[PDB]
Amino acid sequence: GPSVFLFPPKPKDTLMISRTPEVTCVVVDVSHEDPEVKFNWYVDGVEVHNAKTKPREEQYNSTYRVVSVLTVLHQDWLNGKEYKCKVSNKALPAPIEKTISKAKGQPREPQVYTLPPSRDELTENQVSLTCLVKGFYPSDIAVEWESNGQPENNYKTTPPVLDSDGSFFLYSWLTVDKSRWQQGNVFSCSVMHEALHNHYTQKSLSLS
Amino acid sequence: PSVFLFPPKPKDTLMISRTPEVTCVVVDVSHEDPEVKFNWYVDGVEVHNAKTKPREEQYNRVVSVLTVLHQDWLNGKEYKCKVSNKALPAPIEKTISKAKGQPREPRVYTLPPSRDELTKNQVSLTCLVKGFYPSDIAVEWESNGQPENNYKTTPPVLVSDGSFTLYSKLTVDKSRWQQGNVFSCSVMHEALHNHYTQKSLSLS
Numbered sequence: 518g519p520s521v522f523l524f525p526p527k528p529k530d531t532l533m534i535s536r537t538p539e540v541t542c543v544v545v546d547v548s549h550e551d552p553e554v555k556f557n558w559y560v561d562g563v564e565v566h567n568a569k570t571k572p573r574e575e576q577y578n579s580t581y582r583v584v585s586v587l588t589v590l591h592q593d594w595l596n597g598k599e600y601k602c603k604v605s606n607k608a609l610p611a612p613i614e615k616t617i618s619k620a621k622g623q624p625r626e627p628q629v630y631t632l633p634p635s636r637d638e639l640t641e642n643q644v645s646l647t648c649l650v651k652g653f654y655p656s657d658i659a660v661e662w663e664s665n666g667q668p669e670n671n672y673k674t675t676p677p678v679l680d681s682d683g684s685f686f687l688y689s690w691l692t693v694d695k696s697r698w699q700q701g702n703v704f705s706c707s708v709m710h711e712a713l714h715n716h717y718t719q720k721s722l723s724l725s
Numbered sequence: 726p727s728v729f730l731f732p733p734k735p736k737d738t739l740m741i742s743r744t745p746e747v748t749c750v751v752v753d754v755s756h757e758d759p760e761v762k763f764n765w766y767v768d769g770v771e772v773h774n775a776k777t778k779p780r781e782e783q784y785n786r787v788v789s790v791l792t793v794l795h796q797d798w799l800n801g802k803e804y805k806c807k808v809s810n811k812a813l814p815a816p817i818e819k820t821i822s823k824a825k826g827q828p829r830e831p832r833v834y835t836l837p838p839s840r841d842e843l844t845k846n847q848v849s850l851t852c853l854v855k856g857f858y859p860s861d862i863a864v865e866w867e868s869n870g871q872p873e874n875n876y877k878t879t880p881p882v883l884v885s886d887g888s889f890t891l892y893s894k895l896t897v898d899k900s901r902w903q904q905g906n907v908f909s910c911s912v913m914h915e916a917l918h919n920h921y922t923q924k925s926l927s928l929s
């Protein structure tokens with residue numbers, strides 16, 4: 518019969534003011550004979566009516582996929598409000614309910630450390646500037662780099678990794694030509710996370 | 726019924742003494758006919774050396790493990806699992822391979838704890854593995870001729886030239902680093918000489 522999956526907002530969407538955090542209720546394996554899906558959305562048990570339900574779409578496997586999207590308020594998601602999708606369909610014994618919210622565990626803020634290129638790397642034509650983000654919970658986080666007060670767009674960041682103490686770490690890094698580092702330019706690693714003061718911190722990195 | 730084909734572990738692929746194997750797993754086989762046999766293919770030629778596991782149902786799985794030749798897998802020969810069952814329009818095939826393209830070796834750099842981390846009780850020793858292809862790799866830590874196990878390693882990340890990089894973090898007590906112990910990051914990857922390299926790190 519029909520199955521239901523309930524997805525949380527993307528991390529940047531929860532942490533950035535100009536972005537739209539959304540919870541997504543997806544229903545799959547909907548038959549031809551019982552094609553109609555109904556959604557009811559609840560926020561800490563109160564029903565809301567402004568979600569946006571997409572029309573059913575037949576999939577290559579001859580079943581329907583129906584999707585409902587509820588936009589969540591930034592503050593509500595951060596306060597741990599619970600979002601419940603309820604799906605009704607006649608091929609089901611009872612309506613299926615799924616609930617999602619922010620990770621439950623005690624919040625912990627990131628420690629942010631900047632690491633200069635390895636000595637052995639200095640012999641190359643590009644070097645790596647590293648930023649270690651450590652010990653944060655929940656795993657929702659966003660990292661950016663800047664040079665001389667302006668965005669750097671050529672950096673990469675690992676996904677969060679689960680650590681032994683139950684928190685998360687990641688590494689971000691920026692690769693730059695050796696002359697640029699050698700000159701004494703300043704680079705900065707910026708982190709947005711809910712548990713930081715102002716949900717933001719910045720640490721800097723520069724030739725010694 | 727649907728078919729999933731899983732690859733060998735990286736170390737099994739890179740060490741002559743180990744047995745690299747691909748796994749063909751079928752997932753939703755009807756009780757109306759729980760009958761399925763496999764035909765395993767290697768570059769269009771069929772093999773008969775696959776060994777089916779002791780089948781075992783669960784509330785709600787048939788698997789053939791094919792041992793692959795070390796060089797064949799490295800040369801990216803195609804391993805095609807073919808699954809037959811009466812609930813199928815056609816017998817269905819899944820094909821698996823090592824990622825195609827010329828291998829590029831990782832560069833391995835060892836990184837000391839940030840000065841700001843030195844205030845803390847435990848510190849992070851970092852190993853940067855950079856620019857490798859394909860992403861199959863294994864990373865480990867050692868101290869004083871013996872395995873060190875309180876490390877974590879990120880997944881490989883795709884970078885702009887199409888190769889991969891990752892970081893591995895070893896956590897140790899601040900005093901222990903402070904004594905002058907030597908720690909080591911070892912990496913296994915097909916493009917390395919002897920498929921192995923090691924870089925080391927100790928207090929200056």
Ligand SMILES: *[C@@H]1O[C@H](CO[C@@H]2O[C@@H](C)[C@@H](O)[C@@H](O)[C@@H]2O)[C@@H](O[C@@H]2O[C@H](CO)[C@@H](O[C@@H]3O[C@H](CO[C@H]4O[C@H](CO)[C@@H](O)[C@H](O)[C@@H]4O[C@@H]4O[C@H](CO)[C@@H](O)[C@H](O)[C@H]4NC(C)=O)[C@@H](O)[C@H](O[C@H]4O[C@H](CO)[C@@H](O)[C@H](O)[C@@H]4O[C@@H]4O[C@H](CO)[C@@H](O)[C@H](O)[C@H]4NC(C)=O)[C@@H]3O)[C@H](O)[C@H]2NC(C)=O)[C@H](O)[C@H]1NC(C)=O
Nearest residue numbers: 520521522523524525527541543545546576577578580582
């Ligand atoms: C018919 O087709 C559709 C397939 O659609 C498409 O068309 C078919 C024809 C093929 O072409 C497909 O290739 C193609 O996808 C089939 O529907 C699929 O059904 C399976 C389940 O049978 C669903 O799998 C679930 O996937 C989620 C993760 O899914 C995200 O990532 C997928 C890529 O891997 C991506 O395809 C999905 O779209 C989805 O992507 C996310 O989408 C949201 C909203 O759009 C977006 O915001 C996200 O950013 C985006 N993410 C990404 C990475 O892009 C996976 O999590 C589910 O697994 C969990 O749940 C199950 C039970 O517990 C169980 O199956 C698993 O064990 C796993 O369990 C969970 O563990 C987590 C750990 O945290 C825990 O939190 C959970 O609580 C726990 N349990 C539950 C219930 O969650 C599951 O794997 C596919 O999503 C679905 N595809 C689509 C597009 O909806 C359909 O099955 C086909 N029917 C048949 C008969 O073949």
Ligand SMILES: *[C@@H]1O[C@H](CO[C@@H]2O[C@@H](C)[C@@H](O)[C@@H](O)[C@@H]2O)[C@@H](O[C@@H]2O[C@H](CO)[C@@H](O[C@@H]3O[C@H](CO[C@H]4O[C@H](CO)[C@@H](O)[C@H](O)[C@@H]4O[C@@H]4O[C@H](CO)[C@@H](O)[C@H](O)[C@H]4NC(C)=O)[C@@H](O)[C@H](O[C@H]4O[C@H](CO)[C@@H](O)[C@H](O)[C@@H]4O[C@@H]4O[C@H](CO)[C@@H](O)[C@H](O)[C@H]4NC(C)=O)[C@@H]3O)[C@H](O)[C@H]2NC(C)=O)[C@H](O)[C@H]1NC(C)=O
Nearest residue numbers: 727728729731732733734748750751752753783784785786
């Ligand atoms: C009935 O239950 C069975 C039993 O399932 C298991 O046990 C039951 C009791 C419950 O606990 C289950 O929740 C639990 O799964 C169900 O069987 C499952 O069926 C789903 C789909 O139907 C399969 O999902 C796929 O899983 C693989 C990853 O699988 C590894 O990790 C699993 C955890 O999710 C682990 O459980 C698996 O065993 C497997 O582990 C690997 O196994 C090998 C063999 O031993 C081993 O060597 C490895 O070490 C081991 N690895 C690890 C880490 O342990 C995942 O790859 C699939 O995603 C692919 O397919 C999706 C749909 O096809 C697609 O959306 C994804 O994007 C992705 O597709 C691939 O995408 C890339 C690029 O995008 C492309 O290159 C690929 O070509 C493309 N592939 C395809 C096909 O398009 C997906 O998540 C479960 O594996 C399967 N598990 C078992 C044990 O059978 C069964 O479905 C249930 N039936 C019903 C009707 O409910």
